[PDB]
Write a protein that binds this ligand. Sequence first.
Ligand code: ADP
Ligand code: ADP
Ligand code: ZN
Ligand code: ZN
Lengths: 153, 317, 116, 116, 385, 89
Amino acid sequence: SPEQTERVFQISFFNLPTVHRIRDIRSEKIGSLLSISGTVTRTSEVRPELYKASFTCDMCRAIVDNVEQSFKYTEPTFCPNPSCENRAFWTLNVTRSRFLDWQKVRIQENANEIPTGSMPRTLDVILRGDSVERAKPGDRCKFTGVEIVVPDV
Amino acid sequence: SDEINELKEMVKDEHIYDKLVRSIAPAVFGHEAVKKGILLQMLGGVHKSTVEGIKLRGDINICVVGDPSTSKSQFLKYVVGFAPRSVYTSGKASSAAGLTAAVVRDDYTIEAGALMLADNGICCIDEFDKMDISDQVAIHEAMEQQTISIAKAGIHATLNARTSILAAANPVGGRYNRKLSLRGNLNMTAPIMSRFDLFFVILDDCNEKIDTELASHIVDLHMKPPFSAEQLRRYIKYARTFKPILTKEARSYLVEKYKELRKDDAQGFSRSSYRITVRQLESMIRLSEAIARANCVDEITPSFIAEAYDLLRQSII
Amino acid sequence: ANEGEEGLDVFSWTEEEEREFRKISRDRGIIDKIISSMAPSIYGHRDIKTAVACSLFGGVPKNVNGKHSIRGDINVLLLGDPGTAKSQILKYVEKTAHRAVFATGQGASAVGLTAS
Amino acid sequence: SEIHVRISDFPTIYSLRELRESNLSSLVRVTGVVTRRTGVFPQLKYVKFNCLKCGSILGPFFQDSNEEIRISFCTNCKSKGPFRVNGEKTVYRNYQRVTLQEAPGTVPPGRLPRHR
Amino acid sequence: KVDLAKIREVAAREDLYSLLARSIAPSIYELEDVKKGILLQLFGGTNKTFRYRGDINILLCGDPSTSKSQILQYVHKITPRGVYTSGKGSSAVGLTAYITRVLESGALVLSDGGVCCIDEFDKMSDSTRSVLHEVMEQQTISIAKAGIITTLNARSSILASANPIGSRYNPNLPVTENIDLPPPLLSRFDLVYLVLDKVDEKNDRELAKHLTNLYLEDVLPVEFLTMYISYAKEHIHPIITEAAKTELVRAYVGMRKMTATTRQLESMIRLAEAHAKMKLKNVVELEDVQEAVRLIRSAIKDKIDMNLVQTGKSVIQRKLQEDLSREIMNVLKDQASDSMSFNELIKQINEHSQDRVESSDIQEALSRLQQEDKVIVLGGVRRSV
Amino acid sequence: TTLQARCSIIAAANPNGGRYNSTLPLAQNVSLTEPILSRFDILCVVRDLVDEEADERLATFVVDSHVRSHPENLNARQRRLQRQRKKEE
Ligand SMILES: Nc1ncnc2c1ncn2[C@@H]1O[C@H](COP(=O)(O)OP(=O)(O)O)[C@@H](O)[C@H]1O
Ligand SMILES: Nc1ncnc2c1ncn2[C@@H]1O[C@H](COP(=O)(O)OP(=O)(O)O)[C@@H](O)[C@H]1O
Ligand SMILES: [Zn+2]
Ligand SMILES: [Zn+2]
């Protein structure tokens, strides 16, 4: 077994004192530990995220690895070889880079907390790592984790 | 750790059969034979695959016929809320197609029917008499071959649906008539009647003592059991782990008792077996396997086949 | 469900299999062996097994001078009482034929068959 | 000119629902039904191009049938230029995409299929 | 935009029954049994689990000109939770959960513990009857569409108002066969109220005078009713005593030997539970049991003869089967072939056997004989054996 | 479009009333008409007749098949193939 990578430890914090509704979600508490009860409408394909990325320079074949992609696919700017002056045209290393599972499940609030004459508000929930394919659509279910904000890619 | 010792003290009991036929549906008063049949549906037979590729049904299908106040639907609620992978449905209609897979424009896709959602489980069907003719001809393949084959427009497939059927069908035209035959009171035809494993006729008789005891019992569940539900589930799953095997004397008793069954169904001059078929022979071997699973033994005694023939003799009249 | 056929094409053959075919084809009574071996899990029904063997092997389609066409396949109807294992023969032909399509009841449309 | 090998009977069968990140860059055995099949298309097995400003030609690069070969520069000039296919050495191979939907008897009952 | 002592002071009065009975519908003077049935639906039974539904169900059978949609509007305004909908307006799977755009679900799950008031209840489609069958029985809707399986708790009390076909209907022949609704729905309604009545010029002058008194001139308040139901439904938990079960079982014995089912008994149980919920005593006394027996007795005033089957039709079907067997025997004596045309044989059977009946009854008896396999049908052709 | 569908059609039908009548001809036994019956080359009629000895051998065969097809009856795959061939001989 020659291939040995760093283990991607995932930390799960459950049993919060309170649970939030989708209607109760405000933007003042992003990056905070929240628990949300809801019903999944549809689930997405278990797809690979580019978690840790490695790239090669096309000029001098220098290697830059551990590039982190937050929300868009990014390439390194400065070539680490001081003799080379490359700025663009970086080739991705598919084998060397480390990937993670991704799933985007879309949830809405339950029919018990839906008020009179309202369409249900929706929310996208990201499952990564071990938690992929755990939630099936149409189930009353509680997700505990992080409220995040995503930009227009 | 304690549950395996509890299971060990279950399997060494002297009267396992009576405890298991009394533990099924404790809220429902009476009808111990229907509880025995429902228990045998929860245990069931073993699936067999012949080396010629021919599949043999291991599932058990009960039809319960009775007056409009006989707690057939209470049995249906008990089986749905108790047994895993169980689906309640109405036989008359449902949203889109019920009990059948439907094609949907979105290019067509398959919506699973209530038979498909009860995969390796129990599909409790209410109002089974007024079911649709497409549902009739899909059930005609769905019981035995355990598949529904749909070839519509651009999409063709076969869909495996391993499902044991519990149905509760009211007699058409009112209550059950005791003078008529059991075939006369139901809307089903011959082949779908022969596809059912066993039948249970229950009547709403009008006597003083039975009515007073039933009424006191049903008010005794309003603000007033040999095995618990988890205990029953553990023992039933342990019986599902058993795969019983036959003996030679069991084969001899089964062929002689199939001779006795085949003799007694003669329709006079026509020499026609209107109800007793080979499906009754597969019914007897499935009920013998279920009863051998009930006592948690690996072999079928000829007494088990005798009890199975007693069950078919109760269902035949 | 059988995991014993190891290969990309189950209906393919090797040269030794062709030699065994030529060996067993010259045996007198191979017709009765094929008929008795067709659906082995079903007892009796010699007419059914013979008709299924005839439909499964089939005749020869003919083209006369580029002007006339003769159908070569054989279509077999099984009419019978329930509980006579009519559908298990159909499932055996599904296992046995090189290409096999199934349809039943109201679930087969007019354009689910033919083409749409 | 070239021979190809079809590897048969991989002992691990993975459905489309069970594919994860650990199975990338590896052989997978997938059961599924084909719904959409495109036509036969010729594809350049080796792509080569002519730089217009320089006399040197770009070397032939093998096509991986996933993404086009990214031409950052030329072998004589270190900048992008006009590139078009030379007829000196061209090799064509067949290419066809199929939409492999999961089989409806394989999926959990009532769920959605997966497309790869 | 745009305490509980008031509950306790009317809880101690002994005249709160007629007070709340005239408070719910002050405009309608008659049908006090109808308003007390709707009142006991607002109170309802307790949610029991170990599950049985505690809510009573009311179907109003009456003429459209007789005021019933006013009562539906009033029970909509009184209730804390509840939705008024029209039967002609919503059908198919509209009243239950349907996939749109998300899952936009209907009123049968949005009104948990409340009243769903369906006007023009005769125009339910067959899919909607099948949905409503598990609404009454399972108190839980369940669908499986677009990869979404949902099992949603209905737990709703239904109030329906039905329309007879065309004219008002005579009381001599039973009214239930006029109503287009299937008898599986009628067997699950706890209370049916015949709103049909005839003019007798007694209070119709009073109705016209007080109806014009809103033009000539300009009991508990509705908000007090709303908080009273909201306090009674969750903060009050009645219990069943061992004493009242004896009067319950002898009342059921009296009903059965008069005609009754065990659904009627369990309706008495939940009705007495709802009356104890109204009285805020947290105990089921004697009096609510006899009140529930009286109300269900008045409902059955209007061997159960359900499934839209009267025993006279149930015996004349077999009589026509015997007459068709005799006609087939006469045809077999006349000719060797037993196959005959349906119209000519039906006309001969109608002319020769007995008085004139429907032509559908003879072919229904022949379909019965198809089920018993005595006679074979082709198509038509009817071959006797 | 003139497609080719060289199909061998194997159909399984039922008689009228659920059971075949031996004293009646084939035409009113089936719900099929003359042209759909006319293309079919071999039409196998099966009658479930009660016999004192055919039911015996049929019952013995079916019970022995249920015994034989039960799951509880040099490597693993080689001996599995060997015992499957021994079972099917
Ligand atoms: N013997 C009994 N024991 C317990 N409950 C009963 C019994 N008989 C009737 N019931 C109650 O009465 C109801 C009878 O309804 P049921 O006969 O199932 O209607 P249907 O015949 O239309 O399905 C059930 O819900 C059940 O709770
Ligand atoms: N030799 C046989 N003759 C008749 N039936 C058999 C025989 N062997 C097995 N069977 C039974 O026939 C059943 C399948 O019958 P099927 O073809 O579905 O009936 P139908 O002909 O009404 O469709 C199987 O469950 C099997 O147990
Ligand atoms: Zn560089
Ligand atoms: Zn260049």
